[PDB]
Amino acid sequence: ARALDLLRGLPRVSLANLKPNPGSKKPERRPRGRRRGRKCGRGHKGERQRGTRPRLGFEGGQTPFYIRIPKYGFNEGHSFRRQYKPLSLNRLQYLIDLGRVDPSQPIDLTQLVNGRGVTIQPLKRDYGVQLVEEGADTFTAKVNIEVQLASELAIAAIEKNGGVVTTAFYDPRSLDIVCKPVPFFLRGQPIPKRMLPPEELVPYYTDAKNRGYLADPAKFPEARLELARKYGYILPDITKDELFKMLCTRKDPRQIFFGLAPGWVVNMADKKILKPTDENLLKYYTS
Amino acid sequence: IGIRLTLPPPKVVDRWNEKRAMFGVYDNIGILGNFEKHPKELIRGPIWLRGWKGNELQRCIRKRKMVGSRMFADDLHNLNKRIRYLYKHFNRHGKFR
Amino acid sequence: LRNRVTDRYFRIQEVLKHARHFRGRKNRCYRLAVRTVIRAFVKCTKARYLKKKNMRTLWINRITAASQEHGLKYPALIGNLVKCQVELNRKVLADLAIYEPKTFKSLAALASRRRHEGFAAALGDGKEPEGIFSRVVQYH
Amino acid sequence: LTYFSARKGKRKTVKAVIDRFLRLHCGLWVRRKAGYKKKLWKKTPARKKRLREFVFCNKTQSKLLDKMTTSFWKRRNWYVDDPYQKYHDRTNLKV
Amino acid sequence: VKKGFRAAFRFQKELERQRLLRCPPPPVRRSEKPNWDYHAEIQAFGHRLQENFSLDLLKTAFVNSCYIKSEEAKRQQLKSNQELSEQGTSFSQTCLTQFLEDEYPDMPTEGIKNLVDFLTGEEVVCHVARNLAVEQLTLSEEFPVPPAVLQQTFFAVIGALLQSSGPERTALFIRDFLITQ
Amino acid sequence: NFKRISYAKTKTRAEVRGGGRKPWPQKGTGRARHGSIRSPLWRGGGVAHGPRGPTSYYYMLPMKVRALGLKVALTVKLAQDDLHIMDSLELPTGDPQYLTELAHYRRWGDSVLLVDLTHEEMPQSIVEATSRLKTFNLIPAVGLNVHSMLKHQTLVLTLPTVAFLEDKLLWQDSRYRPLYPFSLPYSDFP
Amino acid sequence: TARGTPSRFLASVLHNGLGRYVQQLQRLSFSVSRDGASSRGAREFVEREVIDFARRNPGVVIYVNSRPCCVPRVVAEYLNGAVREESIHCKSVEEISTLVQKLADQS
RNA sequence: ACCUCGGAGCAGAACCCAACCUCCGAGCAGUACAUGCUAAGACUUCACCAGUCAAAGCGAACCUCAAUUGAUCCAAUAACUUGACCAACGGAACAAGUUACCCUAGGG
RNA sequence: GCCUGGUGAUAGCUGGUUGUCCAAGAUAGAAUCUUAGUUCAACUUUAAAUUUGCCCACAGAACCAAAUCCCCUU
RNA sequence: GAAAUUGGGCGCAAUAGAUAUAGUACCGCAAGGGAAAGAUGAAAAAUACCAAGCAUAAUAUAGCAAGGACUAACCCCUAUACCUUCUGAUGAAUUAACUAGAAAUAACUUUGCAAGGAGAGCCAAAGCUAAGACCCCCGAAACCAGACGA
Ligand SMILES: [Mg+2]
Ligand SMILES: [Mg+2]
Ligand SMILES: [Mg+2]
Ligand SMILES: [Mg+2]
Ligand SMILES: [Mg+2]
Ligand SMILES: [Mg+2]
Ligand SMILES: [Mg+2]
Ligand SMILES: [Mg+2]
Ligand SMILES: [Mg+2]
Ligand SMILES: [Mg+2]
Ligand SMILES: [Mg+2]
Ligand SMILES: [Mg+2]
Ligand SMILES: [Mg+2]
Ligand SMILES: [Mg+2]
Ligand SMILES: [Mg+2]
Ligand SMILES: [Mg+2]
Ligand SMILES: [Mg+2]
Ligand SMILES: [Mg+2]
Ligand SMILES: [Mg+2]
């Protein structure tokens, strides 16, 4: 740089030389003088000079715009609708290429958060991730994803390449513990059990067509075979290759984290796991 | 004639005071002390405005809910009337809406 | 008072150095001195136009007087000196009238001679020789 | 509206506005037409077809509705089977 | 009591100015004020008039005889001025009579004597030498420099210009400063 | 300005004492219409728009701008030829006059900012020498800021503080956006 | 205004163009702070321009005083004993050069 | 006496144009039951709200009149729909006379 | 009644709104318990993006005066 | 308008700051209202120059009181006081001091980082973070509560 070489010849930078970047500080306009204040910008004496102009929306007496118009329920149940952040396959190929998501392990929702691929916020009632078919062509990855919704074409794009998709469910509580697990293990509570879907979503997660986590593992080869026939690819058998033991692992329902169990208390400090051995707690946590 | 006839005593300022020499130390206690403290935990002042900035109506609301239970009687009363005034001013008066 | 104004003797005194020569309380009481001082500055700038105007009428009075001494009138002198391509102006003619009255007499003689050639030329109309002092110098 | 509440010192939304209008993320407010369910017996079917429409709002109506709601209502919403979801992003404007 | 310093300083100096107008001090000579280098300013006096001097000779042109006497009155607790002033006033009288006999051939010589005794009077020569910075360079006893003394130093400066650079340049000097009066 | 809290407060026309009733009637007197003797026009009235209460001027710049500010202060001190690097701050004697003579001989400057890595492991000699001086100041490496690098003419690091600053400031480049505060546990941070 | 101000007639000092022309400016007196932000343009004027200026007219004797001032000044003195004190406070070198040449050119 | 809507003159020829200005009117009736559904492009009562016109298409056959009217909320109804001389007609969900005892803030 | 408090009551009404210098800048209207006021528009202002704007020639605009609309060239 | 859930002074310095030198003087039957002001020096066992207003120093034809000027103060010539309210009456004896624009949603400008930003929560189809930059003074009749008063 020539610029530090300029700094040799100049006097030392002190607290007496400093100056803001020109354009940063607009100057304060205040009502003194001939221009900035005689009426001081309020105009002639009315109601807008006195300071008492009526509320926003008041049209002076005719019925206002925002009230002449019929109530319709656009926003009727807005805060109970479920939301699902999209994760395109273009995005997920992008994360796999740059080392941010390791495809030689299961891709739960924690692994998409820790790679900072997807930001999901459980308040503002996101119920998790939905896979999105964008970038299905040019998706070249053998992967094991657990994503709460998935379109057919995204299941097809993963399962073509030797992948596994499953759609899990998470409560707001459970989803909140999944996304940011470390501020949960500082909360001192035992790991809870994730709840089953409500009645609206039980027919979703019990269908083998959209790869539900509560569905038969006896109806899956028919569905994998059907997509393989529809979108014209020969269905590879996952059983042959070496990642199969990795590509088979699911956590059962009522299990939030992968290798852990509900009812355990993670002791982050001295790196232990306290497990309960009372029978009533074991009936409650293994329910 | 409101102007003074003799010039005032000189203002002797010690630039190398203890406070001035050590001003600004531990402003970066976060970014180079492994984030164990925030710099806002360096500031001392009223308990209702340590690491918080608001306009006046918000300073009054925050002061009332944070410390208002042990405020003196006519201070509490003056402060209730200031929130009531400043409410009626910010919400119903001005130029822009 | 957080910051009230210290330097106010000098603002007053910026106005009142212009009023020290007024009469009455206008010379001392800022409230009165401001109106009169403003009003004095407005007159002071509108008086530039009137300075130029009044000099010119003063010169026309002096040229009128001095040319009436030689029988001419003012329109005759100015007209028939333009017509001789003597483009002296009113300031110089008034100053010659006072300080050099032989040059002014000879200018009045040149202007009345040109005036008569104007008469004799515009009387005997048709193709004729032009007047001697009536000739112009063409510039190219 | 209320520019600073007495409890939080925040802005408040006018809930009439939410009850009648739909903010699309690009900034367009959708509304329903006034009188679309009144006196249908005396309206021609062209007019009834006009009243049963989701009509966009003006520029100044739009800015008036922006000022009367808060940033919660201006936010991306990834609903499940949203009917209006293809109308959020604005395609193919040349300003 | 309004806090601050700048209005008290401005007001302090305006009070100083009204003190100087109400009771002004007696005028001190210039060599007894700041920013004086005597040698530099004699050289400046040379170059100012557009001629050259022998600087020591011009230095003796400014040294009076009253100054030496009061100086030696101050020793007990220098060439004079008179030779150069004699030569300078003799020469300026004869050259002024040359110019005024050449450009006015019909004048009586009583008239030429009164003209020349005007152009070398105390009023004229003292008016000229207070605007050529002669008075500032005069080593005199008393201030202001009394008019006979300053007349003597002015013609001493003419004598020094004569010995410096001949009769023609002094003729132009006398022409440009005494005749224009 | 972030630590700054102004304690200036004045009284408004409601808080100042008395002045509850009209001084004189509205119309009958020839005087001006007044409503209290404590309105801001009266000698003794409230202040119309004076300073109100303790006000805090708190704001955080992003931590990448504070970190970049530390870097920029270091390159500027080095480029202006005011950085000096020691191996340790161990003096042969604990007198102040030794240290001022050393700083005068090497043409440092009027004021020197000595920086050691920790507050615990500062050598006793530099502590005794700089605890008496007004312009030579010991600071731990945690205490390093920008106001006091600009306030002091020269700045003196040790080699462990240099490795420390490279570590702590090159970390802000090439780090993810935070999931939660860095005081909480991470895979790799402390 | 003209009735408030004094007036005079157009004059010279000693018939200044008749015989010869004499530079009416005797002394300049610059006073310049060594450390001080207001006499920066004065400093760069002494370093760059004052020697060239002092050579372009040798009848003028120039004193640069260089004390700790808080406002720098130039003090022009004239042959007829007038003194014009002007400030060179926070001026560039070019502005000071035009001011000093202005003081040189006048009487 | 009036308060909303329409026609004509004022306002002669694109549009617009007031008045306690000049004259007429309106607050429906009749026929049809595809007076179904959709949809390019437009006009527009000087804003908004409301208003108007409409090709192609699917489905079928093989509206007249100028005005002829009323927002939102609320009700009633399973639903489709329906609801004001809210005529002060951009409509406050429901409120009369009077004060030489008037009072205050202002204007002439 | 008077006092204290609510209370800095409220006021579409009256009065008042403090350095300098430069720049751009004035007359369609619609609703309104509305005509001493507000809201929208029109006009005004700054910043930005782009491409035409203004003046206009033939041709052209209905039956029962002066002009205008439209409009390439320039 | 919730909840679950989460976790000493960039103060004032005698019209300022407290009403405060004092709830005193004074006013009121009472409840109640409620002031003002001081400045030597180390020692008192050491007794300047500046507001308005005037005085020194009254006045000379003619006129918003000046301006152009001028040898010259006046005489000559030019010149319908200021604020505010109207398309074009109001208030001010004069001096000093006091006395009136408070909000960062969105946009803009300037940085940082950037498919991510932010020191959790929040936003993100180039965004996000930070800063800068916008919103006055006085004035009723009243209404209500509690006292004090025949
Ligand atoms: Mg003229
Ligand atoms: Mg009160
Ligand atoms: Mg009041
Ligand atoms: Mg006060
Ligand atoms: Mg006070
Ligand atoms: Mg229109
Ligand atoms: Mg009505
Ligand atoms: Mg109406
Ligand atoms: Mg008010
Ligand atoms: Mg009102
Ligand atoms: Mg202009
Ligand atoms: Mg109404
Ligand atoms: Mg009104
Ligand atoms: Mg065209
Ligand atoms: Mg007080
Ligand atoms: Mg006086
Ligand atoms: Mg007159
Ligand atoms: Mg004014
Ligand atoms: Mg009794």
Side-chain angles (χ1 to χ4, degrees):
Chain A
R2 304 181 190 178
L4 298 168
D5 298 338
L6 280 181
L7 278 182
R8 283 195 204 81
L10 266 62
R12 88 166 87 254
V13 177
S14 61
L15 291 176
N17 290 114
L18 291 180
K19 187 248 290 189
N21 200 4
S24 308
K25 270 55 189 285
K26 267 179 63 196
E28 176 167 4
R29 305 292 182 183
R30 46 191 314 252
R32 268 90 172 109
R34 185 171 91 84
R35 194 250 180 253
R36 281 321 186 295
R38 169 262 210 105
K39 301 281 198 184
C40 301
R42 307 293 290 267
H44 298 302
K45 295 182 191 151
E47 192 182 12
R48 73 267 223 104
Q49 165 163 0
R50 263 60 168 256
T52 323
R53 264 197 285 176
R55 62 183 183 268
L56 191 55
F58 186 68
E59 294 189 7
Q62 71 170 352
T63 51
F65 170 67
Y66 78 102
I67 273 180
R68 292 178 73 68
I69 292 173
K71 299 213 183 187
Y72 185 72
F74 294 105
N75 304 302
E76 185 169 12
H78 73 86
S79 62
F80 307 117
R81 302 176 193 167
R82 304 172 181 91
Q83 296 188 0
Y84 290 94
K85 288 289 181 150
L87 156 122
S88 58
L89 287 167
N90 207 329
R91 174 68 167 171
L92 183 121
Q93 182 65 49
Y94 167 73
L95 293 169
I96 289 167
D97 289 337
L98 270 76
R100 283 164 64 181
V101 166
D102 181 81
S104 292
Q105 288 305 112
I107 313 303
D108 199 59
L109 195 147
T110 74
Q111 304 304 318
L112 290 183
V113 170
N114 293 334
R116 294 165 177 101
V118 167
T119 300
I120 68 165
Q121 45 199 338
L123 313 312
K124 296 305 163 298
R125 74 282 311 162
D126 292 333
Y127 272 36
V129 181
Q130 57 168 339
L131 264 168
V132 143
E133 74 277 6
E134 176 192 339
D137 37 6
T138 64
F139 174 73
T140 305
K142 178 179 288 184
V143 75
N144 184 9
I145 338 186
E146 194 84 33
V147 170
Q148 286 81 33
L149 300 184
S151 63
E152 277 196 349
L153 200 144
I155 306 174
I158 289 163
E159 285 182 344
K160 171 175 180 173
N161 298 307
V164 176
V165 201
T166 38
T167 64
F169 177 74
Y170 290 102
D171 309 320
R173 175 177 176 59
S174 174
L175 193 274
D176 184 75
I177 298 161
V178 160
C179 297
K180 301 186 286 302
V182 174
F184 175 77
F185 302 127
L186 300 181
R187 188 173 289 138
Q189 300 168 352
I191 298 170
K193 47 181 189 184
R194 62 169 169 163
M195 298 316 301
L196 303 174
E199 299 84 352
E200 305 94 359
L201 289 175
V202 166
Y204 187 86
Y205 292 102
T206 57
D207 287 347
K209 287 190 176 178
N210 50 21
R211 264 59 167 192
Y213 79 118
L214 290 175
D216 284 353
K219 289 185 179 171
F220 275 1
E222 299 164 357
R224 297 181 65 252
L225 192 272
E226 277 178 4
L227 282 183
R229 285 179 177 180
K230 177 175 178 176
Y231 289 103
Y233 61 90
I234 291 159
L235 196 269
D237 56 345
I238 306 168
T239 316
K240 283 184 181 296
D241 64 339
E242 291 80 7
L243 271 308
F244 171 67
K245 187 176 295 180
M246 188 272 290
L247 292 178
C248 188
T249 60
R250 298 177 198 177
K251 44 190 182 180
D252 58 344
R254 299 160 87 92
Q255 188 185 1
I256 291 175
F257 292 108
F258 207 77
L260 294 91
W264 295 4
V265 175
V266 173
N267 193 7
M268 291 281 288
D270 58 355
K271 295 176 178 183
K272 288 181 180 177
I273 292 174
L274 306 180
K275 307 194 278 196
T277 57
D278 181 73
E279 281 194 356
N280 292 320
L281 295 179
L282 288 177
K283 290 181 198 171
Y284 170 60
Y285 286 120
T286 67
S287 295
Chain B
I1 319 98
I3 190 159
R4 61 180 302 156
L5 274 312
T6 55
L7 60 167
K11 181 170 71 74
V12 278
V13 178
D14 204 2
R15 296 292 172 188
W16 290 102
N17 192 0
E18 171 68 26
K19 266 178 206 160
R20 280 180 188 120
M22 306 311 288
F23 181 79
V25 187
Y26 310 119
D27 285 336
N28 299 117
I29 188 139
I31 68 174
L32 75 141
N34 298 116
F35 298 92
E36 301 174 354
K37 295 190 76 62
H38 199 283
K40 72 190 174 175
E41 299 171 0
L42 268 290
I43 82 170
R44 299 165 71 82
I47 189 195
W48 66 94
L49 41 92
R50 284 170 180 159
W52 184 84
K53 171 197 175 73
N55 66 333
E56 188 191 355
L57 188 264
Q58 300 171 5
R59 277 185 274 127
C60 287
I61 285 170
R62 185 169 168 96
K63 173 169 170 57
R64 179 170 67 179
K65 80 179 301 298
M66 281 190 66
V67 93
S69 57
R70 63 197 187 75
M71 204 177 296
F72 284 5
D74 43 357
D75 295 335
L76 212 167
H77 180 258
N78 284 320
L79 179 129
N80 285 334
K81 290 201 293 183
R82 184 99 255 244
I83 298 163
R84 206 176 305 129
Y85 174 75
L86 278 186
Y87 178 89
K88 289 185 303 171
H89 173 76
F90 286 155
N91 291 307
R92 301 172 185 181
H93 297 301
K95 174 173 184 191
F96 293 104
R97 57 181 44 103
Chain C
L1 281 314
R2 204 179 159 286
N3 50 14
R4 50 163 183 167
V5 172
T6 67
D7 193 72
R8 187 186 277 120
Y9 174 74
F10 302 98
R11 301 177 184 191
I12 306 301
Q13 288 301 109
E14 276 180 347
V15 166
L16 293 183
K17 63 184 173 172
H18 299 292
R20 307 274 76 172
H21 64 96
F22 295 174
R23 288 180 44 160
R25 310 195 205 97
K26 307 176 196 92
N27 50 57
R28 296 170 304 249
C29 300
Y30 181 81
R31 167 200 293 280
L32 311 179
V34 155
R35 310 197 191 108
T36 315
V37 153
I38 284 165
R39 193 160 159 75
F41 286 174
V42 174
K43 293 173 188 279
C44 181
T45 65
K46 294 187 175 184
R48 303 199 173 112
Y49 297 95
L50 293 170
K51 177 170 169 179
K52 297 171 175 58
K53 175 166 185 156
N54 293 318
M55 292 296 310
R56 181 156 163 156
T57 72
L58 189 265
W59 296 334
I60 295 172
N61 290 335
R62 293 179 167 178
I63 296 165
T64 299
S67 65
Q68 281 288 121
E69 284 182 340
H70 300 296
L72 275 172
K73 296 183 204 175
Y74 173 76
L77 178 72
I78 292 298
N80 298 116
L81 277 172
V82 163
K83 288 181 191 186
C84 294
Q85 289 180 355
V86 172
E87 283 181 350
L88 290 171
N89 65 351
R90 274 93 181 160
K91 188 180 113 180
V92 155
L93 282 180
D95 292 338
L96 291 177
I98 299 169
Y99 287 108
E100 268 126 7
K102 296 164 153 196
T103 297
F104 198 80
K105 185 180 179 191
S106 75
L107 282 171
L110 188 260
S112 77
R113 173 66 177 275
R114 176 59 175 85
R115 195 196 177 209
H116 293 315
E117 289 175 350
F119 290 149
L123 176 62
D125 295 335
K127 53 180 180 180
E128 285 185 359
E130 69 279 11
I132 295 181
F133 287 103
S134 172
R135 297 187 185 100
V136 287
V137 180
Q138 297 297 320
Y139 284 98
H140 83 296
Chain D
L1 73 152
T2 297
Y3 294 88
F4 297 95
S5 69
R7 302 291 201 106
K8 306 296 291 172
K10 291 182 183 171
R11 290 172 83 99
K12 289 197 168 182
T13 73
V14 177
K15 288 297 194 73
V17 163
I18 286 145
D19 219 335
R20 292 156 211 264
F21 287 91
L22 169 73
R23 161 90 180 186
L24 303 179
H25 190 268
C26 51
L28 295 174
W29 292 79
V30 173
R31 66 181 178 82
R32 195 70 117 109
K33 292 197 74 71
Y36 76 104
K37 54 166 61 172
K38 294 219 64 60
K39 305 179 179 61
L40 285 187
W41 63 276
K42 57 161 71 169
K43 294 181 165 65
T44 182
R47 185 179 171 183
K48 286 150 71 170
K49 166 66 160 56
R50 284 193 286 273
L51 289 170
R52 288 182 280 108
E53 283 186 353
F54 290 143
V55 148
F56 286 109
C57 291
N58 202 353
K59 171 184 185 184
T60 66
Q61 284 166 359
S62 174
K63 303 309 190 302
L64 189 266
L65 293 174
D66 282 329
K67 290 182 186 296
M68 271 173 164
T69 62
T70 60
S71 309
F72 177 75
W73 298 97
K74 269 78 161 173
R75 160 237 155 68
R76 303 287 299 184
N77 290 313
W78 294 105
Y79 299 140
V80 270
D81 299 319
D82 186 68
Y84 302 109
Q85 193 158 24
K86 71 172 176 171
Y87 296 111
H88 282 150
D89 183 75
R90 196 73 187 276
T91 59
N92 216 343
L93 262 174
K94 194 173 67 182
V95 176
Chain E
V1 175
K2 303 169 209 183
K3 59 202 175 200
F5 176 83
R6 300 204 186 193
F9 185 80
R10 286 182 74 179
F11 195 63
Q12 200 56 243
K13 296 186 76 64
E14 270 220 0
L15 287 179
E16 292 172 357
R17 290 171 185 155
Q18 286 177 8
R19 289 180 184 105
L20 285 183
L21 291 184
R22 188 192 65 188
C23 297
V28 190
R29 78 188 71 192
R30 173 58 204 183
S31 298
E32 297 177 351
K33 290 184 279 191
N35 300 323
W36 184 256
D37 191 2
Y38 190 77
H39 177 64
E41 207 134 17
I42 272 186
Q43 288 195 358
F45 171 73
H47 291 290
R48 175 175 298 128
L49 298 179
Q50 283 167 347
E51 56 249 8
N52 47 359
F53 295 84
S54 51
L55 289 175
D56 54 347
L57 220 157
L58 187 60
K59 282 182 182 188
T60 62
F62 292 108
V63 176
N64 291 307
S65 72
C66 63
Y67 174 73
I68 318 175
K69 292 175 184 183
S70 71
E71 181 179 7
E72 288 178 353
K74 291 175 192 181
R75 183 179 297 167
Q76 302 164 357
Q77 295 176 358
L78 282 181
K79 270 200 192 179
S80 171
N81 216 3
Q82 186 61 252
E83 175 182 359
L84 285 175
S85 67
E86 182 271 336
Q87 294 180 2
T89 198
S90 299
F91 176 73
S92 70
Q93 281 173 356
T94 67
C95 271
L96 280 175
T97 59
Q98 277 308 114
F99 285 117
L100 285 177
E101 276 174 355
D102 290 327
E103 289 300 317
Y104 298 112
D106 295 336
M107 286 283 294
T109 64
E110 298 192 0
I112 297 167
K113 282 173 186 173
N114 288 115
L115 283 178
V116 166
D117 293 338
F118 171 74
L119 298 179
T120 62
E122 288 180 1
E123 307 87 11
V124 164
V125 166
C126 287
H127 169 66
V128 165
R130 289 171 191 159
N131 303 321
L132 286 182
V134 171
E135 186 184 11
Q136 286 190 356
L137 292 172
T138 52
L139 265 47
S140 75
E141 183 178 1
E142 60 195 6
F143 194 76
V145 176
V149 164
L150 190 142
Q151 186 185 15
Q152 180 171 348
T153 61
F154 185 74
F155 288 107
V157 167
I158 294 172
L161 204 266
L162 205 160
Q163 293 194 0
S164 298
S165 67
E168 295 178 359
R169 290 301 304 280
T170 33
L172 292 168
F173 184 78
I174 291 163
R175 196 270 300 272
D176 294 346
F177 289 104
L178 295 179
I179 283 178
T180 59
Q181 298 301 309
Chain F
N1 287 313
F2 85 99
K3 283 173 308 200
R4 184 252 174 117
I5 290 174
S6 84
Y7 292 96
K9 182 174 186 185
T10 63
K11 296 195 199 310
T12 194
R13 58 182 293 177
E15 301 156 358
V16 67
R17 173 68 154 234
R21 97 275 205 97
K22 284 192 73 60
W24 50 79
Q26 175 67 23
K27 187 185 280 83
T29 319
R31 284 180 286 182
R33 33 167 60 184
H34 283 105
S36 63
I37 58 166
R38 294 293 186 251
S39 79
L41 304 197
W42 290 63
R43 172 239 148 86
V47 184
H49 301 299
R52 296 299 307 175
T55 69
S56 72
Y57 291 40
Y58 175 74
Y59 66 108
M60 278 288 123
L61 297 178
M63 72 169 73
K64 292 179 190 169
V65 179
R66 269 100 47 98
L68 202 141
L70 282 174
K71 293 182 190 174
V72 165
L74 290 169
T75 81
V76 157
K77 299 310 277 192
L78 178 65
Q80 301 288 125
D81 193 8
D82 287 321
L83 195 71
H84 296 288
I85 297 167
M86 303 306 169
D87 48 355
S88 68
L89 299 175
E90 286 177 349
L91 297 171
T93 182
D95 285 338
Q97 189 175 358
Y98 175 74
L99 221 170
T100 61
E101 286 178 353
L102 194 152
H104 184 271
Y105 173 70
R106 298 182 178 176
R107 285 198 170 198
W108 285 358
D110 299 336
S111 55
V112 182
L113 185 62
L114 296 149
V115 171
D116 196 2
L117 195 142
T118 49
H119 186 266
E120 180 200 351
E121 204 181 0
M122 284 198 259
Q124 179 66 255
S125 190
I126 191 72
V127 173
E128 287 297 320
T130 63
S131 71
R132 298 171 179 173
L133 295 167
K134 271 195 154 170
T135 56
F136 297 1
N137 311 127
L138 263 182
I139 281 186
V142 192
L144 181 60
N145 50 337
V146 164
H147 179 279
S148 68
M149 286 175 77
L150 297 188
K151 177 167 176 76
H152 298 96
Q153 285 175 353
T154 68
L155 177 114
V156 170
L157 302 183
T158 74
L159 277 174
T161 58
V162 168
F164 177 80
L165 285 174
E166 286 172 341
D167 189 15
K168 293 292 192 291
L169 288 175
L170 288 176
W171 176 77
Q172 297 282 340
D173 322 333
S174 87
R175 60 99 171 151
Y176 273 123
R177 23 85 65 99
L179 294 180
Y180 47 72
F182 297 107
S183 60
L184 271 64
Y186 271 100
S187 165
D188 52 2
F189 177 58
Chain G
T1 59
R3 288 175 87 111
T5 307
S7 68
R8 68 178 176 94
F9 287 106
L10 201 261
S12 292
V13 172
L14 280 181
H15 300 91
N16 198 13
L18 270 184
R20 66 186 63 183
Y21 172 69
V22 176
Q23 169 83 254
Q24 288 296 323
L25 190 258
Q26 291 182 1
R27 275 179 295 282
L28 285 178
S29 296
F30 294 90
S31 70
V32 173
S33 63
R34 178 192 60 193
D35 303 314
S38 61
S39 66
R40 174 179 33 153
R43 275 174 290 192
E44 297 183 1
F45 177 79
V46 173
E47 192 173 354
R48 286 186 177 101
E49 184 68 26
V50 83
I51 303 188
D52 303 323
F53 173 73
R55 287 172 180 168
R56 280 176 291 161
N57 38 26
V60 179
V61 38
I62 298 163
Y63 292 102
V64 171
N65 294 120
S66 183
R67 63 208 170 162
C69 64
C70 201
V71 164
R73 266 73 174 249
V74 50
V75 180
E77 302 186 7
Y78 287 84
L79 273 168
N80 57 347
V83 175
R84 301 272 86 85
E85 188 165 7
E86 288 183 0
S87 73
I88 52 174
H89 182 81
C90 281
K91 285 179 176 176
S92 56
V93 193
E94 298 83 6
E95 222 290 336
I96 294 170
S97 292
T98 65
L99 177 127
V100 167
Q101 189 56 251
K102 182 193 84 273
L103 287 170
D105 286 333
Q106 69 185 4
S107 169

